[PDB]
Amino acid sequence: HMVPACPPPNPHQVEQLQDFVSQSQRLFVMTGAGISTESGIPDYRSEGVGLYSRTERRPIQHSEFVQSQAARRRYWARNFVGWPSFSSHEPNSAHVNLCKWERAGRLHWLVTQNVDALHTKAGQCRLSELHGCTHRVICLGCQTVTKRSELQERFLNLNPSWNEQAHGLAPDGDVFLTDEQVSDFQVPACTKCGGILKPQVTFFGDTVNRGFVFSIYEQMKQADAMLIVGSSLQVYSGYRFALNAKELHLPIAILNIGPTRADHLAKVKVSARCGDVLPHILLQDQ
Ligand SMILES: Nc1ncnc2c1ncn2[C@@H]1O[C@H](COP(=O)(O)OP(=O)(O)OC[C@H]2O[C@H](O)[C@H](O)[C@@H]2O)[C@@H](O)[C@H]1O
Ligand SMILES: [Zn+2]
């Protein structure tokens, strides 16, 4: 299924990660798509199983969505089909345990690259969604934000004879459809202004808002350590925060099955399934 192959977890790494967490009172956590593979959502870059390893799916480019009605129709028809399954995924034990650490006052702040809403479903409050969330829709004309669930209803009224089955769900809820399968589909406009609606996610080629990025960096200034969970950090948007931790001289730990771009920066690396390991990390001696 969606989790990449990994050797049995090594208990000495687990013990090293524990010693790391025990020394932190204000943990800054970064997560990527690897935290959600145990929920049934594929990641992008896992050897063998990741969308880009195993398939020839290609990300939509920001520029193309913005400049082409036909691209927007393609994008939304696929998103439509994928939405009932994508929106139904549930948080796993890794999401839950990170929420426990927050409750315990040990997690200072968590940034995610994921768009799946799973940390929100788990109850994580001290959260930044770096790349947005597919559960939100924004208008490119007026910047009004609405719920993607409400858009589903609008798609059904506009496209009453639409059916296709959902095939190859991606980490952003996209499913494959052919250009002829999607050719007819009609996209609802903004109810306030009539402008073009976009999911409130940072597509390839877009950039994260600078004020938002700055505000996350501000949260980092109070942390005393960084943990990265389930990201290859091959995408600069995420890797810059590990670079920032190193500039702040924070110790860095990584819980990730494959290699990451920040491996060179880590004090501790646990190559294991995150859901196997996080439940064992304790916040109180026991
Ligand atoms: N259960 C697991 N436990 C631990 N590690 C895991 C697990 N499942 C997978 N991994 C590891 O999880 C890691 C997943 O890495 P990648 O697939 O690059 O996802 P990203 O979140 O970093 O992608 C960043 C952006 O790229 C996109 O364009 C979007 O914009 C994304 O937001 C691998 O190293 C796996 O070994
Ligand atoms: Zn509008």
Author numbering: 30 to 315
Tell me, in the authors' exact words, what the paper reports.
Among the protein Lys deacetylases, sirtuins form the evolutionary defined class III. The isoform differences in preferred substrate acyls are caused by binding of the acyl moiety to an active site channel with isoform-specific features.
xSirt4 yielded well diffracting crystals in presence of ADP-ribose (ADPr). The xSirt4 overall structure shows the typical sirtuin architecture with Rossmann-fold domain and smaller Zn2+-binding module, with the active-site located in between them and harboring the nucleotide that is well defined by electron density. The six-stranded β-sheet of the Rossmann-fold domain provides a docking patch for the nucleotide, orienting the reacting ribose close to the conserved catalytic sirtuin residue His160 (numbering refers to xSirt4 if not stated otherwise). The Sirt4 channel has a small positively charged patch at the outer entrance but is generally rather hydrophobic, and we speculate that it contributes to accommodation of longer substrate acyls.
